[PDB]
Structure 1
């Protein structure tokens, strides 16, 4: 290949629109690909491919899919150094994002009749093939950081601000008025006396909550699969209760209803804030873990809610004269509370027994032992083991999942921004001053390929030897 390139050989496609680079990639010929890369004419070799072909795509995507160790060299070619002296301050590193851009750029014609390329093509190709060693290369890291500081940080701080604009005045209202009291824009109704100090803050916060609820209703009606999501339910509850909490801005309302809606609003607000936090990378793996553990716990209540029924309905009969067990529902809630080890042995079992107030002493003490064995020991250890397994499974894929979240974030953001804006904020390179403020499988695969080549050569040799025997001269050693 090097000899044929040194002479001016043409670079064309065939009947399958495959160039020689596609054939070298599909057969995992590493050395010829490295030769094509290290040489001149690499630019035209890269440009020669053609769209519209579902089998022979852009050379970069194919190189990511088949020979990632060559893509690593291709990326190493994109880091330039200045003085090559780590101590110097004018020593800067320049990163070039030449091969991560859209394939529709390489071709000069670019018809794009039916060709639609998704944003961040190279990074998505790396994610869909688990090329974690490539996603950690400094060029890709700087590419993602550039995208972030270019528009992602801003597009998400706007969302956080739009939510906090209703989240913060709610909390300010709660911790500044005594629960149970009625209040309107004029002040606090002390039943009638009217406390009027701090009325300005109260009015401002009541207006900011109202506007946020209205805009949330409008946005959600604009989005209206919908009822299936959980965020939709949470936000519907938040807006419906927050609009009632501050309703005395227009029409009177009983204080009881007002504060019983405030108690739900102020809880679901801060519970929904975690779904906003799950975007950022330093603190979004904990939300994944929390969700996994919560799902695993909820899938087992369909089973381990009959243990509670058994024990609660038996304790309702055995200990019926005591207040905690004086009703079926109260007796089931007390048994749920005893699940962590708070059994009240001395208050519910020993002291009534020494007063001759247990109707069934032997059964009551046998139920205590069987409950202690079954629920605070066996069931809790089962849950702990399940959680340990789930967290290990999540940690096994932490880095790839963390990077894929960011890639998907920016990919989704690209499909909604206007074209001219992306043109304006996009960059082609970056400059950095440092001073200023799975292996064993690959090995055995390679040696399998080597063994197959060995077999092929040995068979050719065998044929040659048989030819020798059938052509030679035999005179003195004839039979």
Structure 2
């Protein structure tokens, strides 16, 4: 009864908690009474009703969280009052042991994408970004690039397979200063990365292989080992850089999709590896007299290579058969047809359909996943930053 609530509020009724530590606003929210909650919000005593709750009540939490969980439309009405058109956005209701970004974390946990897309919440997230999040991520990215860029410069400036040290390319002392600077930078970033899950494994491999690549800075090593580690280090350096790009608006969802597709494929390789094994061993027996199928392992690698359509029909089946060099020609052609039916068609189309479904499922909640990524990044950042710095950089309102 919204009119009843308004009349009782206009007579200075005391806002209290019952024996279950619930106020009238709590009772309205838990019953989804939109009209009386709007009456309370638009009342002149809304701030007084906001302050009445118990921090130790599990069911009757802060009324803002309850509003987000139960009546998000009333929360939208409340947020519309926080943007006053030189538009000024107020973040009084957007944050309150409590987790950082409490209101936005509640919005994410309740799939309140219409609430998270509100201009007030967008400006709140942008304020947190420009306050500490962009700076923190840029420091992390620059620390990574301090070893990523010198390594790439070394790879593209020294001929692979050739030993080199600080002096130069073992002797070609022409780009010696650049080589020494890049070697020192890679070494320092690798030892600093030792002082800073799949990502940890990737970073450990990166730092170890980068150290071995620039080891001749102190101790001489053979060129073969040096460049063998350099290939691994540069490959994993540029592969792990994609994990730093996941913390950007335009790149995070694509990295999420790539992870989903890769995990779906990897969960399926443990099954179709036996299909590939069957076809590879059969081709090893049938096409043994040919170099691509001269060994079981080479035959399996070749069968894996023709899974995209590079079957090599003329070089492996037609020309050998017309030369009478195909032992079991009928068997070879039957297995060729069965392979083409199975792997490049049935298996590839299975993978394509799985990928289509995965991408569709990701795109269903793309905006929610993006905003949740931003909220999670800033929440995790706030849990590690000192309270004095957070108080220094925390804005209570933003004028645009």
TM-score relative to the length of structure 2: 0.97
Task: Write the deviation string for residues 84-129 of structure 1: whole angstroms up to 9, x where unpaired.
Answer: xxxxxxxx11111121131xxxxxxxxxxxxx11111111111111
> Shift in Å at residue 330 of structure 1?
1.0
> Shift in Å at residue 264 of structure 1?
0.8
> Shift in Å at residue 366 of structure 1?
1.1
> Shift in Å at residue 155 of structure 1?
0.5
> Shift in Å at residue 402 of structure 1?
0.7
Q: 2:324 aligns with which of 339, 353, 356?
A: 356
Aligned pair 1:275/2:247, yes or no?
Answer: no
Aligned pair 1:318/2:295, yes or no?
Answer: no
Q: 1:57 aligns with which of 52, 55, 61?
A: 61
- Counterpart CA distance in 2 for 1:24 and 1:353 is 83
- 1:65-80 aligned at under 5 Å gives the runs 65-80=69-84
Q: 2:298 aligns with which of 292, 317, 330?
A: 330
> Shift in Å at residue 174 of structure 1?
0.6
Name 1:185's counterpart in structure 2: 166
Name 2:277's counterpart in structure 1: 309
> Shift in Å at residue 50 of structure 1?
2.4
Task: Write the deviation string for residues 417-458 of structure 1: whole angstroms up to 9, x where unpaired.
Answer: 1111111111111111xxxxxxxxxxxxxxxxxxxxxxxxxx
Count of residues in correspondence between the two structures: 396
Task: Write the deviation string for residues 314-367 of structure 1: whole angstroms up to 9, x where unpaired.
Answer: 111111111111111111111111111111111111111112211211111111
> Shift in Å at residue 383 of structure 1?
0.6
> Shift in Å at residue 48 of structure 1?
2.0
Task: Write the deviation string for residues 348-401 of structure 1: whole angstroms up to 9, x where unpaired.
Answer: 111111122112111111111111111111111111011001111111111111
Structure 1: segments with no counterpart, 5+ residues: 82-91, 103-115, 220-228, 433-479
- Counterpart CA distance in 2 for 1:127 and 1:259 is 47
Give the 3-state SS of the residue equivalent to 2:169 in structure 1: strand
Task: Write the deviation string for residues 59-102 of structure 1: whole angstroms up to 9, x where unpaired.
Answer: 11111111111111111111112xxxxxxxxxx11111121131
Q: Find the structure with the greater CA-based Rg.
A: 1
> Shift in Å at residue 147 of structure 1?
0.6
Task: Write the deviation string for residues 240-268 of structure 1: whole angstroms up to 9, x where unpaired.
Answer: 11111111111111111111111111111
> Shift in Å at residue 409 of structure 1?
0.6
- Counterpart CA distance in 2 for 1:337 and 1:135 is 47
- Counterpart CA distance in 2 for 1:376 and 1:101 is 54
Name 2:335's counterpart in structure 1: 367
- Counterpart CA distance in 2 for 1:177 and 1:20 is 74
> Shift in Å at residue 8 of structure 1?
2.2
- Counterpart CA distance in 1 for 2:133 and 2:319 is 65
Aligned pair 1:124/2:105, yes or no?
Answer: yes
> Shift in Å at residue 131 of structure 1?
0.9
- 1:213-292 aligned at under 5 Å gives the runs 213-219=190-196, 229-292=197-260
- Counterpart CA distance in 2 for 1:22 and 1:151 is 35
Structure 2: segments with no counterpart, 5+ residues: none
- Counterpart CA distance in 2 for 1:315 and 1:198 is 51
> Shift in Å at residue 14 of structure 1?
1.7
- Counterpart CA distance in 2 for 1:168 and 1:33 is 57
With over 3 angstroms needed to count, the CA separation of the structure-2 counterparts of 1:101 and 1:348, relative to structure 1, is: closer
Higher-helix-fraction structure: 2
- Counterpart CA distance in 1 for 2:111 and 2:220 is 59
Deviates more, 1:40-49 or 1:281-290: 40-49
- Counterpart CA distance in 1 for 2:278 and 2:45 is 79
Please provide the CA RMSD for this pair: 1.1
